[PDB]
């Protein structure tokens, strides 16, 4: 009888997560792009101004499907998120739901940082241990649990 308890991924400390070297990989998602636009900050230069390090953004196919699905009010968001500076993942699961796609994607790798803004996703991300989220705030970004913010 096969039980399955996932081991704590061995590039993690107690909660320090030494696998997050300063060239970062972030996970952009949908209402974070929308709030970045309606707070009028940029994306790559905004992340650089918040983290003082070179950040590579990533968007998944599930989040791109959500951004296409949300209609023509966010054509600015879609034109911004088809940026050649960002990269793109490729998901393989059923149901384009950004929340469980994101939190599954990060809890089986523990190396991405999650750039989110909605309440349930922030709650699940800060529930699971040792991955940093960032969010919009005022006219800049804000990091929640990176060990070296400065």
């Amino acid at each position: 009888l096969t039980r399955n308890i996932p081991q704590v991924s061995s590039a993690l400390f107690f909660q320090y997560n030494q696998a997050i070297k300063p060239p970062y990989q972030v996970l952009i998602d949908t209402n974070f792009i929308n709030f970045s636009i309606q707070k009028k900050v940029d994306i790559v230069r905004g992340m650089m101004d918040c983290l003082l390090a070179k950040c590579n953004p990533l968007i998944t196919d599930c989040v791109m499907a959500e951004l296409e699905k949300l209609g023509p009010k966010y054509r600015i968001a879609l034109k911004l998120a088809r940026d050649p500076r960002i990269k793109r993942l490729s998901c393989s699961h059923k149901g384009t739901y950004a929340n469980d796609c994101l939190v599954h994607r990060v809890l089986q790798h523990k190396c991405y940082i999650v750039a989110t803004n909605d309440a349930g996703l922030k709650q699940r991300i800060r529930k699971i241990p040792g991955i940093p989220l960032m969010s919009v705030g005022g006219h800049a970004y804000v990091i929640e649990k990176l060990p070296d913010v400065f």
């Binding site: 909660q15 040792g130 649990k145 060990p147 070296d148 400065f150």
Partner: peptide, 18 residues
């Protein structure tokens, strides 16, 4: 030296411990 953006936090505490 400067105090960080928060000094009472779990990830920062394990950072200073390590």
């Amino acid at each position: 030296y400067s105090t960080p953006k928060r000094p009472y936090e779990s990830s920062r505490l394990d950072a200073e411990l390590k």
